[PDB]
Subunit: 98 residues, 6 copies
Amino acid sequence: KQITLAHVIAAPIEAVYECLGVDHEGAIGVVSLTPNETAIIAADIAGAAANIDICFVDRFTGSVMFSGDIQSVETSLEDILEYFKNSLGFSTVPLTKS
Amino acid sequence: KQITLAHVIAAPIEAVYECLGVDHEGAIGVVSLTPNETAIIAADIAGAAANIDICFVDRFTGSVMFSGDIQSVETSLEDILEYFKNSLGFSTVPLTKS
Amino acid sequence: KQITLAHVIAAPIEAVYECLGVDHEGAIGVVSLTPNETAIIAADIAGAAANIDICFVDRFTGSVMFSGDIQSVETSLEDILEYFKNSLGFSTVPLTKS
Amino acid sequence: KQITLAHVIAAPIEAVYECLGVDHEGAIGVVSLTPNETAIIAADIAGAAANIDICFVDRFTGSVMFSGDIQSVETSLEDILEYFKNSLGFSTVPLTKS
Amino acid sequence: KQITLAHVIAAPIEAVYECLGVDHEGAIGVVSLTPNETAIIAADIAGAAANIDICFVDRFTGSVMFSGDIQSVETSLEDILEYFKNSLGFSTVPLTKS
Amino acid sequence: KQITLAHVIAAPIEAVYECLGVDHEGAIGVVSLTPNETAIIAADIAGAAANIDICFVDRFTGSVMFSGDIQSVETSLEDILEYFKNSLGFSTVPLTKS
């Protein structure tokens, strides 16, 4: 049980927005974890902050992405890292910004 | 022989339901175990409570997911943990809620 | 976390330009990394040099391509390799030219 | 990083030419490699011998095809295998003739 | 590298002939292989027996079909299976009749 | 190699008949399989019961449809499922009625 990425893109670009198909507004939170199925649980905690929009949940690769105000995304990532670490006994990586 | 996840999502969201393709009603039980093939045996015990709906069984990764009323999912997970522990001699993780 | 390709094509040809659909001017930077989703983060750093044009970002295969003056592409690739190595703790391959 | 095919068809037929849409003259060099995006780099090296004509470059499947005199195609395939092996650290298959 | 189908239809029907657009005479050899591009190489070996007529070559799906006397089609399929197995190092399925 | 649909419509309607262009008499057998080209082989086995009429064979999508008495259509579907499973080593879905 590992979270290998819990990243936030503060200021994405047109090509990054167009790729995900979002409103060209806000940060993007990216998460990678193993086992791959737990992307469904991570997506749930990220989606609990109602202003966060789930971009895609891939249960095969273990990937989650979501958009919203920089602050909401950081809280969502922080919440995912905190729960998975303390409750689900995952070994989490530190949060990263670009 | 390990069950590394036996998790229930009590109140999933639109994006989580849409991802699995269910009726946007009920909890979701998630299970990870090794060896990976025994996802077929776990799915059988989860599917024995006839109101539980099997979402996907992955025998390559060792992943099972299923929907239904919060109570049915908990019983299904509890039954899987109890059988695999006592009968199949697995080392099980405690049941988790989100 | 691996960057397996960080390549620059200094002098591409008509068929290579026509394939990507660019202005038949400049070098092409090609990047492959795992996990595949981090193509979104690599594309962001490549797109930060405003004269670089993002050709395609594939989050499923982990592939990024972008065009612009040979010098801009090298800096973009160099920046991607430097950040992913130092910040995101990736194991990067050396930059390559054709 | 693998080149799984680097094949030359010395004497193709009407149906093979008509399928690719070439001048019904010369051999056809076929290349398959992973990652799939590096078909763009292989196409560049094949297209460097100016008498070779690029038929199609598929960056999604990792496929390159090109026509020209039997000798030009062999050199192009030989060059691709040599560069990818020595420079890009690919594990190449032997060249094949039909 | 896999040949998943190498099938012969000994006695096709009006609707099968009309679908392919052939002279309503002879067997039909059907071939599926991965990678998909090698349908071009399979078509070449099938077309080497000059009485065989190439129906379609799909390089995207990896599909080849061709008509002619039952004996010519069997030899063409047998030749494809033998070459791809021994030379191109494919894992071939047994030849099938309907 | 998968048969994903092997369905029979016992009592179709005017709009369904008019859509296919049949004599407004009998059931309709619908089949979906991958690879898509094997629709030609499925159509052959369905067309072997001479009272069955082939509606369309799509080798690109992998789709077959045919009309005739409810009993003939069931036998044709049953025969397709049995052959593809036992001979061609397909993983077949159960037959369905509407």
